[PDB]
C-alpha cells in the first residue's frame, strides 16, 4: 500500500543497516541487457554506500 520497499544485501551476506524506497520503475527496457532498470533510493547517513558496488 506504500510504494515500495527494497533492502540491500552486499557482499557480506547480512542486510544493510536500513532500507528504503523503490522510487520508480523504468519502462524503457535497455536494448543490450533486455532488462528494466528500477531505481531504489536509500538513505545513507553513514557513507557506507558507495556509488557503484
Partner 1 sequence: RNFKEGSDIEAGVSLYQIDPATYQATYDSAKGDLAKAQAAANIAQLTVNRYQK
23 lines the binding site for partner 1 (CB under 8 A)? yes
25 lines the binding site for partner 1 (CB under 8 A)? yes
Show the cell assigned to 53. Answer: 558496488
26 lines the binding site for partner 1 (CB under 8 A)? yes
24 lines the binding site for partner 1 (CB under 8 A)? yes
30 lines the binding site for partner 1 (CB under 8 A)? no
Whole-angstrom CA distances from 23 to 14, 19, 32, 38, 40 are 23, 12, 23, 8, 5
Show the cell assigned to 48. Answer: 557506507
Contacts with partner 1 by CB under 8 A lie at 23-26, 39
Amino acid at each position: 500500500n506504500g510504494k515500495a520497499k527494497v533492502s540491500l544485501i552486499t557482499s557480506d551476506g547480512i542486510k544493510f543497516p536500513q532500507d528504503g524506497t523503490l522510487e520508480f520503475s523504468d519502462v524503457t527496457v535497455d536494448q543490450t541487457t533486455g532488462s528494466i532498470t528500477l531505481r531504489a533510493i536509500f538513505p545513507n547517513p553513514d557513507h557506507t554506500m558507495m556509488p557503484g558496488m
